């Protein structure tokens, strides 16, 4: 129902933002670099500056697309966890949010 | 010194035992299957029965070899975490023990 759909969207934003913050700290690379190196998100020239325009929409519930690319988000969480291994609460939180999303998508 | 060497051996046994218990529960497969499918540990015919004779020595501090194969143990932890994703305290403990071993080996 509407509650499950809104929960999925809230978890997707939490998971993506958490994963990017972890990527930035552990890899020492930018959000731009995650998109460019993984090939999972496109780079655009906006306001005369390179931007991960679509990825950026997934970092706030207000801008999340009407049709989220759930598999691309799960591939993003997997890519970040594949390249960033530092064990700890921050990583555990991303793993837990990944499992939550997967269970919501398959229930 | 002796303290660091004994700590490394104690952490190796904790990590291996933890990882195998997690593999068995999450994969629903045996220790034998972890060895056979990964190819990381040999199978032997002892007492007329198939056994992971060398791997078994890593599950008790009393039997741990004088010369542990540290890389084979780290490859074992990586293989189990690659195939078993269930997020939770049990998985976090294995990740934490893996990081502890790596830091001891590089300090």
Author numbering:
A (entry chain A), B (entry chain A): 1022 to 1128
Question: What's in the article?
Answer:
Chitin is sensed in V. cholerae by the hybrid histidine kinase ChiS. Previous work from our group demonstrated that ChiS is a noncanonical hybrid histidine kinase that contains a DBD at its C terminus.
Since no structures for close sequence homologs were available in the Protein Data Bank (PDB) to serve as search models for molecular replacement, we used the single-wavelength anomalous dispersion (SAD) technique to determine initial phases. The structure includes 105 of 106 residues of the protein (1024 to 1128), two uncleavable residues of the purification tag, four sulfate ions (SO42−), one 2-(2-hydroxyethyloxy)ethanol molecule (PEG), two formic acid molecules (FMT), and 200 water molecules (HOH). The structure of the ChiS DBD revealed that it contains a fold that is reminiscent of the canonical helix-turn-helix (HTH) used by diverse DNA-binding proteins. Structural insertion between these helices is not typical; thus, the sheet feature found here is a distinct variant of the HTH which we refer to as a helix-sheet-helix. Consistent with this idea, the β-sheet insertion has the highest B factor (a measure of structural motion) in the ChiS DBD structure, indicating that it is relatively flexible. Specifically, these residues were located in the β-sheet of the helix-sheet-helix (R1068), helix 3 (R1074, K1078), and helix 1 (R1090, R1092).
